[PDB]
């Protein structure tokens, strides 16, 4: 699957805290093969949520604010 699909599914989660719970659960559901793009989706979602500004592409300096 594409990371965009997961991005839209994860974009429904807010507060950041809620996202940490879904990724924690899906972590034990994924077969590791889709986890590759899932990581990008989670990272992407966290970046836009942390900067409080949605962007298609995420600037390199934004990854520094990811915990």
């Amino acid at each position: 699957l594409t990371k965009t699909d997961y991005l839209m599914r994860l974009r429904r989660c807010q507060t950041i805290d809620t996202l940490e719970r879904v990724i924690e659960k899906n972590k034990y559901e994924l077969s590791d093969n889709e986890l590759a793009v899932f990581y990008s989706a989670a990272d992407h979602r966290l970046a836009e949520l942390t900067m409080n500004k949605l962007y298609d592409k995420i600037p390199s300096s934004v990854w520094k604010f990811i915990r």
Partner: protein, 44 residues
């Protein structure tokens, strides 16, 4: 083990054909920030 082959430009340039620039860039931008954090620690 998973870093030794990454230190060689020969293998690095070879395995870099496994994915397109798309994924390579998204992960690259994630690595440079990590190194910076380590820099801050080594500087402190």
């Amino acid at each position: 083990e998973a870093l030794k082959i990454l230190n060689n430009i020969r293998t690095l340039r070879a395995q870099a054909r496994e994915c397109t620039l798309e994924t390579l860039e998204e992960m690259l931008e994630k690595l440079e920030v990590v190194v910076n954090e380590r820099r801050e620690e080594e500087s402190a």
